[model samples]
Target: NDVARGIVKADVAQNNFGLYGQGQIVAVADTGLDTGRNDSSMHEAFRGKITALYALGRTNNANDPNGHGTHVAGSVLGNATNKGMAPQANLVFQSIMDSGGGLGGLPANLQTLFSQAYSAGARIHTNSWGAPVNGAYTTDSRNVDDYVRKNDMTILFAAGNEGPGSGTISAPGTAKNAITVGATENLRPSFGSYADNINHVAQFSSRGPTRDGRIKPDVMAPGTYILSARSSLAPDSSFWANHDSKYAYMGGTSMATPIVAGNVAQLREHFVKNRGVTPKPSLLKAALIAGAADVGLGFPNGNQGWGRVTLDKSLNVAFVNETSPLSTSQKATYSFTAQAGKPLKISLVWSDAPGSTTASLTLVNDLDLVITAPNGTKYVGNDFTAPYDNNWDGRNNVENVFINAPQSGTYTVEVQAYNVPVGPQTFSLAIVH
Candidate 1:
């Protein structure tokens, strides 16, 4: 009976306020779980919603001896009703830690768990666990990251518990493909000031620009006094049997990773809900970074890349207001008339709602038009087509590179029809400000 009421209360049909993560899938990898919190089996949000509780340490035994993973999961996915960010979003537990100390478990077993999560439809993978110091980002860790991207899944990692300096992020989180994150305060990461400062990265949080200089800790979020669920120090006991308490407050980069992951999920949901685009993990990361609000004293300094994340800025984006129409067998030249030194970012989407493979599109400057290639085209979209899903996820296509038309004169934007599998086409181009 309460399960049915929980379903009614779990109304994410309208999460316009960022309350419900809408329709995003997330995985929490940390201390094993103690699913039987006093609030668990009887909790409204608990019902059948607390599903896929796996004990990566021991698949048959999902328990939390460390207590850290339980706290992290509550912050990221606990239904605020039962204490969570998005109660509706499903979760998969990758219990990487047990009594054997974090990351000291059997390597072979960890590999199997990662592969299992990836294949089991876990799209958003969250890791609050990692190695102690800096290293080669580890081969097994890199493999898991590559696997996630290969399957179009996103992996979010805490930039370790060290932070506020270079080379501080742990392995796994330090991997190239995985999105690394640090902590953030209202002011700077340290400095102990909250007024006047609307946003600041946590100093104890890890910093980036990797050994290969790849911009680690991609973004930041709130890490102070964050709240989530708590296990009674026992997993097998019934929810009430171990009723020490049902909630707790925690801090650290681990707290920050899941919040950002939740935002990614929200953005993914927004894309699916509004644009009908199932963005791959790479694309989702791109959208998040590209759409982040520039923070700190100046612009995107190494400190807080692309600044703190804002859902409205990233997800509530509008498309091109004005569209130029093109027809069959037509070779038209359009000009992007802009001011001096303005970076123009135009997102080209086919009007076909998933356009044709052969419908060709290109953007060129006077020099490009004047100095044509052997194939007889000035320059094509960034991916040699416009935005397309070649081997990626739901949406893909081709779009020209983000070239600077330094001193914008009448830069020629060309649209031509070629060997498309299907025809009678229409192209829709969106230029984001």
Candidate 2:
């Protein structure tokens, strides 16, 4: 059951959370989707979910020939029988992969696909594929960053299947703004221990330290042996059936990406429904990272960027989120009071403009964070790692400050435009304790 892995426990409850991502849109950029046997408007998930389908590859309709896109779509919003992470969320499907199971669209074409989805009202995008593993950032990677900052949308990508080793993350997933996902085994199929052994990183889940030294695969999710809708258009041999012909079991960071995308939809729905506040992409990213569970390993490492995505922890935590615009020579200050003996974590994230197409460094506008404690101890934001000579801490757009035990008092956090080539740069900061 999906509940066994904590998806339902973290998302659904008896209090009527009612945050099933209703009306929110998620765009799937993958192989084509199966509009079901009769070419219905829905894909066996919820009715009125599939709003539009665009064909960017060889296919004329959103029909799957390779069976990958259908599986990914099911994970995002399958209904009563199939039960995905966000059962009520809407979808916009795009065929971006070829019949040979290779990514069909190029980096430029991908930008067009995302633009269409955004125009169709999709704020969250899920990509379950990656570029060739050349160990260097590509134009596609920069495009992802460009769109996220330009459109203010969240994009999630698979960390690739070449893992159990470091520095194996692929492009697009390497985009500075992309929310890269890693795969974790469900544990029920392998160890027969559902609760005790779930959420372990899969051997094939790609690890990262982008060749330039930035940590990646931003978060982890349950992926191994995941069961979702099977495409009727594809041959039955394409499935690993444990129940019936309508469903199949698959694994990879590909499967994991949609789960996080679904959660993003749910989080968005909850905020819009309850608080009447639409969360910024940077704030949501900070919440997901800050609320992530460590699972016994210290965070900000190379393997798991933050940890497993825990929806409840993120929803339950009290956070102070602020967003502002800064000029090239101006600084913005925000204050938060922390309780004594309690731990505090603050993250500053912004979407920088796209960098040069052929530059060693990809940061166009550089911003910095300085947190001053009541005791006059200053905490400066630093995302660089000397060991790899790369910046994983948002060298391009993110900075974090973690305090294990803080003295109770007001802390002043300053956001300075270190080298803002562009004026009036937009940024978001989130503080949690």
Best candidate (score: TM-score): 2
In model 1, the Cα lDDT at residue 4 comes to 13
Q: Tens digit of lDDT per residue, candidate 2, span 1-433?
A: 2642264243552135767778789988888777533345555664556777787766565568778888888888777465678878888887776656666643364678788999989999999988747346788887887788778688898998888788889888888788888876665554343223455677787887777666677778888777887776777666544557677777778888988888888877776777667777777777777666665556566677777887765664444344578878678887888888767877777777776546766677777777888987777765323232133333646677777788889999788887778666777776667
lDDT of 1 by residue, 75-134 (tens): 566664435545567777667664566544435534465666766667788877677465
Compute each candidate's TM-score over C-alphas. 0.65, 0.89
Count clashing residue pairs per candidate.
24, 0
Model 2, residue 391: displacement in angstroms?
11
Model 1 worst lDDT window (10 residues): 362-371
* Runs of candidate 2 exceeding 4 Å displacement: 4-9, 12-16, 35-42, 105-107, 189-196, 236-241, 316-322, 382-396
Best by lDDT: 2
